Amino acid sequence: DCIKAVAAKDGITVIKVKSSNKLLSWHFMRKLFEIFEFYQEPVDMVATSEVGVSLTIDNDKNLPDIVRALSDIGDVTVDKDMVIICIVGVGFEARIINALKGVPVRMISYGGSNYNVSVLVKAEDKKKALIALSNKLFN
Amino acid sequence: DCIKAVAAKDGITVIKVKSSNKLLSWHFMRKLFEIFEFYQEPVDMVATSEVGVSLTIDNDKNLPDIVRALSDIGDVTVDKDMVIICIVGVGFEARIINALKGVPVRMISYGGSNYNVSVLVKAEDKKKALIALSNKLFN
């Protein structure tokens, strides 16, 4: 398809869980996603590390019960009022990310099933980020 | 800590699973990680999308049984002989990613628990990618 697009999704919460040292990563990741399953929460973005993982939820109705449950498998921190921006396009993804050079970015994900690049920013940086991505994607 | 580092991990396999339309994402993600738990496989990088997810394993001993099991919850494709590169450092991550402008990249992940940027490339592009990242990170 011959499509270029920029999309923003507001009202996002990011959750960071640093796994307990006691837990083997493969058990930790299953337990983690099982907690999100229980509360029927879709996750738009995920990024793992050696230490732990950050992921998003699109509503906070169940947030306290989710943090409570997660606090059993790791140390949990939360940042509210975030925004997911999705950019739909030979290094393309590098050029797009490079347009965000001047804006703080909390997460980046590329390689799921598409050529879409996903980025998470604070609400206060949404406009700056969208303007830079629109100018680059559509020039 | 006042540390800059570049690290490469060889012998990686990437698995792409496009979820069955029948399945709600939150159930799909738990089932998925539960299959990796059964086979005790750690996952260094993950990237989700609307359609489905891509993830890595560091050995292929259990690969056929994993694809077999996953084929029940989605359409599965696999690419072997990959390499994970980790770069440890106000837009820093954008500048680092921008050094890969000329190299094909299969995945990018940033935001797990660190300021580390993770990238997945084919074995044939390891040297080019490492040279570009070392020059940028260490100049």
Side-chain angles (χ1 to χ4, degrees):
Chain A
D1 55 58
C2 297
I3 300 186
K4 292 192 168 76
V6 53
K9 191 176 178 186
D10 290 328
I12 306 294
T13 291
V14 66
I15 305 181
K16 183 177 61 166
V17 186
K18 302 201 175 196
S19 171
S20 152
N21 272 4
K22 269 62 186 181
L23 283 185
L24 292 168
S25 67
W26 54 87
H27 292 300
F28 169 86
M29 293 295 287
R30 190 272 301 160
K31 292 163 161 294
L32 182 101
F33 283 98
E34 185 162 7
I35 288 165
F36 291 83
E37 182 187 23
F38 182 84
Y39 296 112
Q40 296 170 353
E41 298 291 355
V43 169
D44 299 309
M45 299 187 66
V46 193
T48 59
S49 68
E50 188 81 334
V51 183
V53 63
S54 292
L55 25 39
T56 66
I57 61 183
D58 65 27
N59 67 104
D60 62 0
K61 185 184 184 89
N62 296 306
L63 181 69
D65 294 312
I66 296 187
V67 165
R68 204 160 296 114
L70 291 171
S71 299
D72 280 42
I73 72 170
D75 298 318
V76 182
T77 49
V78 178
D79 276 306
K80 302 173 210 162
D81 297 315
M82 312 295 297
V83 181
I84 293 162
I85 303 175
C86 304
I87 308 95
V88 183
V90 287
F92 152 83
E93 77 296 310
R95 298 178 177 80
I96 284 305
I97 295 299
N98 182 53
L100 290 172
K101 215 185 183 80
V103 198
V105 178
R106 176 59 181 75
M107 294 181 71
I108 299 165
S109 183
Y110 169 74
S113 54
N114 282 123
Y115 297 116
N116 298 0
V117 170
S118 305
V119 317
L120 189 74
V121 300
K122 296 177 81 184
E124 62 179 346
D125 295 307
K126 183 188 183 175
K127 191 178 182 176
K128 203 199 291 175
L130 281 165
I131 295 319
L133 295 167
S134 303
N135 287 359
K136 180 49 49 190
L137 183 68
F138 300 128
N139 87 69
Chain B
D1 55 58
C2 297
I3 300 186
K4 292 192 168 76
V6 53
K9 191 176 178 186
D10 290 328
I12 306 294
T13 291
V14 66
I15 305 181
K16 183 177 61 166
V17 186
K18 302 201 175 196
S19 171
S20 152
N21 272 4
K22 269 62 186 181
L23 283 185
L24 292 168
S25 67
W26 54 87
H27 292 300
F28 169 86
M29 293 295 287
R30 190 272 301 160
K31 292 163 161 294
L32 182 101
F33 283 98
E34 185 162 7
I35 288 165
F36 291 83
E37 182 187 23
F38 182 84
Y39 296 112
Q40 296 170 353
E41 298 291 355
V43 169
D44 299 309
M45 299 187 66
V46 193
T48 59
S49 68
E50 188 81 334
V51 183
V53 63
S54 292
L55 25 39
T56 66
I57 61 183
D58 65 27
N59 67 104
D60 62 0
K61 185 184 184 89
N62 296 306
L63 181 69
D65 294 312
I66 296 187
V67 165
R68 204 160 296 114
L70 291 171
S71 299
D72 280 42
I73 72 170
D75 298 318
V76 182
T77 49
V78 178
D79 276 306
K80 302 173 210 162
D81 297 315
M82 312 295 297
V83 181
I84 293 162
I85 303 175
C86 304
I87 308 95
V88 183
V90 287
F92 152 83
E93 77 296 310
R95 298 178 177 80
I96 284 305
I97 295 299
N98 182 53
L100 290 172
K101 215 185 183 80
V103 198
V105 178
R106 176 59 181 75
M107 294 181 71
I108 299 165
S109 183
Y110 169 74
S113 54
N114 282 123
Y115 297 116
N116 298 0
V117 170
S118 305
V119 317
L120 189 74
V121 300
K122 296 177 81 184
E124 62 179 346
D125 295 307
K126 183 188 183 175
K127 191 178 182 176
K128 203 199 291 175
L130 281 165
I131 295 319
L133 295 167
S134 303
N135 287 359
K136 180 49 49 190
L137 183 68
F138 300 128
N139 87 69

